[PDB]
Amino acid sequence: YLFASDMIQKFPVSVHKQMLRMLCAKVSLAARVDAGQKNGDRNTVLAHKWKAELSKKARKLSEAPSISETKALPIPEDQPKKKRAGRKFRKYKEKFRLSHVRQLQNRMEFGKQEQTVLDSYGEEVGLGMSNTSLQQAVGAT
Amino acid sequence: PSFLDQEPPAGYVPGIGRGATGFDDEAANVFKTLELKLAQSNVKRQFADLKESLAAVTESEWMDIPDATDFTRRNKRNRIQEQLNRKTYAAPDSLIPGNVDLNKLTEEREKLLQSQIDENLVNSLSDATLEDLQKMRTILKSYRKADPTNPQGWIASARLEEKARKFSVAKKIIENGCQECPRSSDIWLENIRLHESDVHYCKTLVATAI
Amino acid sequence: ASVLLPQLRTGWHVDQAIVTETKRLVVIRFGRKNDRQCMIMDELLSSIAERVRNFAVIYLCDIDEVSDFDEMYELTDPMTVMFFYHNKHMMCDFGTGNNNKLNFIVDDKQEMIDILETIFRGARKNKGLVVSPYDYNHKRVS
Amino acid sequence: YIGNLITRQFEDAYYDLELRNSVMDDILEMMPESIRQKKARTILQHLSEAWRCWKANIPWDVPGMPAPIKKIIERYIKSKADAWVSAAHYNRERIKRGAHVEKTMVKKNLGRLTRLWIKNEQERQRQIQKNGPEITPEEATTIFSVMVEWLESRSFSPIPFPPLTYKNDTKILVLALE
Amino acid sequence: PSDSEIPPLLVYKWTQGINNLSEIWDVSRGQSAVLLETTLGEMAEKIDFTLLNRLLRLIVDPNIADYITAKNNVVINFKDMSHVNKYGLIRGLKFASFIFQYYGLVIDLLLLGQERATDLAGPANNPNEFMQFKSKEVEKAHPIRLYTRYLDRIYMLFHFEEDEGEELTDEYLAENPDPNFENSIGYNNRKCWPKDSRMRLIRQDVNLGRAVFWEIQSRVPTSLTSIKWENAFVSVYSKNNPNLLFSMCGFEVRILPRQRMEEVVSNDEGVWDLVDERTKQRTAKAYLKVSEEEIKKFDSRIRGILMASGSTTFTKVAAKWNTSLISLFTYFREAIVATEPLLDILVKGETRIQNRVKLGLNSKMPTRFPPAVFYTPKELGGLGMI
């Protein structure tokens, strides 16, 4: 039901969800106030300022953020970047550094055609020198 | 903006100012006259009359304009896509396309599956290169000529060049190795296995073997 | 353009604008400002200016009021782009054959940032000439 | 040649950008008031922002913009929109032909033609949801009767949901992962 | 595609099937075979989730089906723009192949018909092999002899008698009629062949093809797939045209028998000889070319790998173009020798790299730049070009 209300359907497509949650909340609260009030004396001021609040919410969520000043690139200066080392940093840096078998794959022999695995996706994959000579003859990788 | 607001103090003829580096009259008028004698949009207009229809906007309305507020949020999404593209990574060592096989893979991990459930209860490689197979042949020549009496000498080179050559040439060097070996039965068993015949040759193999 | 990009009024604004900035990299341009070729370079150097602000800087120079630097730097051209670092002309090597200035338009923002970054590298390394990462042989060579 | 030589010695990306700087000059000449530079900046932001919103196919309506400025902006993004659509196509045809194309021009054409293709697609979605499904219950009756009659004629046992314990399960998972 | 035949084997086996049909090439009594090729346009884009979902409830546990359609309904995002796909299939999904092929089976059942598709599939207990029938009678029963579907593309081989052709032409010219003989206009025969090879236009055969295609289009609903004449290629083998023209998986196939062979000239290099199973001799021959679309795709990939994409390095360009041309020569193989226009695009495109490698070294034009640098195994340091 409430999703078919004008209070929601008047605002754009992006805000219907937030207006639905906030709207259902304010409807529950409003019905609770109406349940607390006597039949004789009732005031609409609470649902009025709540409707104003929902209007503010919808207009704020509708208005996007203002553009930021374009972030400038850092000054292109070279730095030693220190060194570090260590189990902690050798693990975290270890995921990035090319492993020894990747280096051996980057090494390709001069005379002989390098060992090349042709994947079902593509044939372009060479193994380079990653496999030993004997290993390359047996083909067990 | 400071130097822009300072204005030029008359002029410095700037060519010499910072030391920049470069990496009759009636006649002239006459020839100019000779050069002379011999030498002889719409949507923007819509923008202009719309510009004229602008006139209804008072300066107090001009002082207030809803600046910026980009509705595409390409600032955020640009920041997120940037965060995603900053770094990349190195591929692990399991992506070297050896792949093993779906046999060791499946029968390997299905027993792990059954373990977890019970707890809850040549490949694609290119052909062997000739020079490499030459290194194979030399190395195995050495390991064979080391001790001819070693059965595993002719068995290791037997299977090992048997994969490379696949042919009766390797099978023949295996056979000669059986001539050197014979007192060991293993070279005769692997010998028979590396020969393919139902009766003719293999029964003779068994005869000599026993 | 003509909003973010400061437009240098006369040869004194050009000279002083070049001399003032030691830290940043002074990028001066010269163009008839009514021409399509220099107009594209302007509307590029607006966003490029916003990106390279922290290190490089952009300045609009038409040849209308300023005839001075034409005799000096040999400028006629549809457009030209001049570079200066420590009040010194920064020579930029493209495949055009003109190492001094670049008369050609580039269509890639990240590229323009790349060549400004490059001439900034050679600039700090004090080298007079820096090799541009790209070629621009067959592109324009006007 | 020689004449101009002794004389001097002895002394479309064009179209669309011209459409933009043209409107920036028009708005630039609209009101010569105070702080006109800041206003030119913010109005430029509304100009490029509006063009990006049209590229995203989104209503650009701003509650605080004056009517004639909104009108001139919509006019711009409409003309720029037309040269954008026509250019994204004509250049595409030049690429299919292979005559003359610029290395990042083919990329920007990929982007633009992409955005108009997504625009056409979600437009089709909006229209289909607008007028309902194209399929009539009569056609659906006939064709569905054909498929059902086929599966009955072939006596096809339906595929069950994968059991809690399936025989080939682990191998199927292996095939997917590989 | 099945799990057995690669698309080339589908082409060859297909031609062998057309040749293995019973007396398909005999026009003596007025028999006319009409091979209708057409792609089903927009299909996967116009697939509907309600109908599709019920058709899946036929196959699978409705949980799986509701998962499938629920996955085909999501929010599709590109840069700074977002929508939902309510209408049409999302191809990037993995099961989208099964859904695609099955909805294609719906359209197949509409095309063929219940009884005729039952005749092609044969008994459910002993399903027949592709293009294999239990009896020549059921082979000769319905006008459709052979039928197959490759993705959107559908291939329907018809065999008509004189009375049949006259009937369908009289019907479609009864609803159609256009006395100005405009039926030759808008008809698109495959234009990549040499004249006489391309099928001739004769009002009886043209009206025959357009009549059959009109029966098919009228047979399949519009809200399901859009079957368009300009997207359809209709070949007509009859007393007039001794050429069977069809494009399967990129191959341009013309088929001519020994009977009518004297009508045109043999193409020598790059041919197939179609052998009948019963006679155990060579009944026909199929001459091949590469389709203009595949040619535009190769030239496409060359211009995109060179003129569109610069910078990078040398060995990567030689390796990428190399694996491209290897892929193409392995997929087309023999047809490359037959097709003249592509053999020029090879030399032109292969020259574009040498220019791209030269102009990467220096601005000047090398007068003679030795081929030994381009053609040399990558192990020796050469570009490894082939």
Q: What is the DSSP string of E138-149?
A: HHTTSSEEEEEE
Helix axes B200-209, B186-194, angle to 10 degrees: 180
How far, in Å, are A16, A21, E79 from residue A28 at the CA level?
18, 11, 38
Please answer whether residues C78 and C37 qualify as being in contact, where contact means their C-beta atoms are separated by less than 8 angstroms: yes
Residues of chain E numbered 28-47 and touching chain D (CB < 8 Å): 45-46
CA distance A74 to C53: 10
| Beta carbon pairs, C and D, within 8 Å | 28
At E182 the three-state DSSP class reads helix
Q: How many CA atoms lie within 13 A of D151 on its CB side?
A: 18
CA distance D108 to D111: 5
CA distance E201 to E183: 10
Which domains does chain C carry?
A: 1-140 (3.40.30.10)
E80 touches chain B (CB under 8 A): yes
Question: Which of D17, D18, D40 is opposite residue C3, by nearest beta carbon?
Answer: D40
Q: Quick one: which of E37, E16, E25 has its CA closest to E261?
A: E25
Any chains having at least 3 CB pairs less than 8 A from chain C are A, B, D, E
Please answer whether residues D153 and E114 qualify as being in contact, where contact means their C-beta atoms are separated by less than 8 angstroms: yes
| Tokens (6 digits) for E44 | 């996967």
Q: Quick one: which of D39, D42, D47, D46 has its CA closest to D21?
A: D47
What length is written for chain A? Answer: 141
Residues of chain A numbered 8-67 and touching chain C (CB < 8 Å): none
**With helix as H, strand as E and coil as C, how does C66-132 read?**
CCHHHHHHCCCCCEEEEEEECCEECEEECCCCCCCCECCCCCCHHHHHHHHHHHHHHHHCCCCEEEC
CA distance E72 to E78: 17
DSSP symbol at E210: H
| Tokens (6 digits) for C11 | 């040869």
CA distance E280 to A138: 45
CA D132 to chain centre: 25
What length is written for chain E? Answer: 386
Please answer whether residues D24 and C1 qualify as being in contact, where contact means their C-beta atoms are separated by less than 8 angstroms: no
Please answer whether residues C81 and C41 qualify as being in contact, where contact means their C-beta atoms are separated by less than 8 angstroms: yes
CA distance D117 to D109: 12
Question: Nearest residue on chain E to A108, judged by CA atoms?
Answer: E379
What is the distance in angstroms between the Cα of C126 and the nearest Cα belonging to chain D?
32
Please answer whether residues D129 and E87 qualify as being in contact, where contact means their C-beta atoms are separated by less than 8 angstroms: yes
**Rg value, chain E, Cα:** 24
Strand order through the sheet with E232-237 = E144-150, E153-160, E32-38, E232-237
Q: Quick one: which of C138, C102, C131, C120 has its CA closest to C21?
A: C120
C-alpha dihedral sign at A104, A109, A114, A119: positive
Say which residues have a Cβ less than 8 Å from residue B86's Cβ, sequence separation at least 6.
none
Please answer whether residues E144 and E135 qualify as being in contact, where contact means their C-beta atoms are separated by less than 8 angstroms: no
Question: Nearest residue on chain D to C110, judged by CA atoms?
Answer: D104
Write the burial class of residue D7 (CB in 10 Å: 0-12 exposed, 13-18 middle, 19+ buried). exposed
DSSP symbol at B24: -
Number of H helices, E strands in chain C: 4, 6
How far, in Å, are B124, E194, E287 from residue E265 at the CA level?
44, 10, 11
CA distance E180 to D76: 49
Amino acid at the residue E123: P
Write the burial class of residue B134 (CB in 10 Å: 0-12 exposed, 13-18 middle, 19+ buried). middle
Residue with tokens 């593209």: B85
Any chains having at least 3 CB pairs less than 8 A from chain E are A, B, C, D
| Tokens (6 digits) for E84 | 């939902």
CA distance D70 to B66: 12
Write the burial class of residue B83 (CB in 10 Å: 0-12 exposed, 13-18 middle, 19+ buried). exposed
Write the burial class of residue E359 (CB in 10 Å: 0-12 exposed, 13-18 middle, 19+ buried). middle
Give the alpha-carbon dihedral of A69, A73, A75, A80, to 10 degrees: 140
How far, in Å, are A69, A127, B93, E122 from residue A134 at the CA level?
61, 14, 21, 55
How far, in Å, are A102, B107, E114, E215 from residue D142 at the CA level?
60, 48, 12, 17
B13 touches chain C (CB under 8 A): yes
Write the burial class of residue E110 (CB in 10 Å: 0-12 exposed, 13-18 middle, 19+ buried). buried
At C7 the three-state DSSP class reads strand
Please answer whether residues B100 and D178 qualify as being in contact, where contact means their C-beta atoms are separated by less than 8 angstroms: no
| Tokens (6 digits) for C16 | 């002083």
Q: Where are the alpha helices (DSSP H) in chain B?
A: 2-6, 14-17, 25-38, 42-53, 59-62, 74-85, 102-120, 130-146, 151-165, 168-180, 186-194, 200-209
CA distance D117 to D106: 16
CA distance C5 to E179: 70
Please answer whether residues A131 and A141 qualify as being in contact, where contact means their C-beta atoms are separated by less than 8 angstroms: yes
Percent helix, percent strand, percent coil in chain A, to nearest 5:
50, 5, 45
| Terminal CA-CA length for chain A | 65
At E163 the three-state DSSP class reads helix
At E76 the three-state DSSP class reads strand
> Residue E247 forms beta bridges with which residues?
E252
Question: Nearest residue on chain A to D45, judged by CA atoms?
Answer: A67
CA distance C38 to C29: 9
From the candidates B81, B96, B104, which should be mutated to test the interface with A, based on the most A CB atoms within 10 A? B96
CA distance C112 to E14: 56
CA distance B48 to D27: 9
What is the distance in angstroms between the Cα of C103 and the nearest Cα belonging to chain A?
25
| Tokens (6 digits) for B7 | 């204005």
E307 touches chain C (CB under 8 A): no
Say which residues have a Cβ less than 8 Å from residue E282's Cβ, sequence separation at least 6.
E258, E273, E274, E275, E276
Say if the Cβ atoms of C53 and A77 lie within 8 Å.
Answer: no
Residue with tokens 């591929």: B91
What are phi and psi for residue C132, nearest 5 degrees? -65, 140
Please answer whether residues D80 and D9 qualify as being in contact, where contact means their C-beta atoms are separated by less than 8 angstroms: no
B67 touches chain A (CB under 8 A): yes
Contact residues on chain B for C74, CB-CB shorter than 8 A: 22-23
Say which residues have a Cβ less than 8 Å from residue D15's Cβ, sequence separation at least 6.
D83, D87
**With helix as H, strand as E and coil as C, how does chain D read?**
CHHHHHHHHCCCHHHHHHHHHHHHHHHHHHCCCCCHHHHHHHHHHHHHHHHHHHHCCCCCCCCCCCHHHHHHHHHHHHHHHHHHHHHHHHHHHHHHHCCCCCCCHHHHHHHHHHHHHHHHHHHHHHHHHHHCCCCCHHHHHHHHHHHHHHHHHHCCCCECCCCCCCCCHHHHHHHHHC
Any chains having at least 3 CB pairs less than 8 A from chain D are A, B, C, E
Please answer whether residues C126 and C118 qualify as being in contact, where contact means their C-beta atoms are separated by less than 8 angstroms: no
CA distance E105 to E102: 5
Q: Quick one: which of E312, E296, E298 has its CA closest to E356?
A: E312
Beta strand pairing call for E232-237 and E32-38: antiparallel
| Tokens (6 digits) for D114 | 């992409």
B96 touches chain A (CB under 8 A): yes
Say which residues have a Cβ less than 8 Å from residue D37's Cβ, sequence separation at least 6.
C3
Residue with tokens 């302007």: C42
CA distance B189 to A116: 35
Q: After which residues is chain A broken (C to N over 2.5 A)?
A: none
What technique solved it? cryo-EM
B13 touches chain D (CB under 8 A): no
Give the alpha-carbon dihedral of D51, D52, D57, D58, to 10 degrees: -100
Please answer whether residues E13 and E131 qualify as being in contact, where contact means their C-beta atoms are separated by less than 8 angstroms: yes
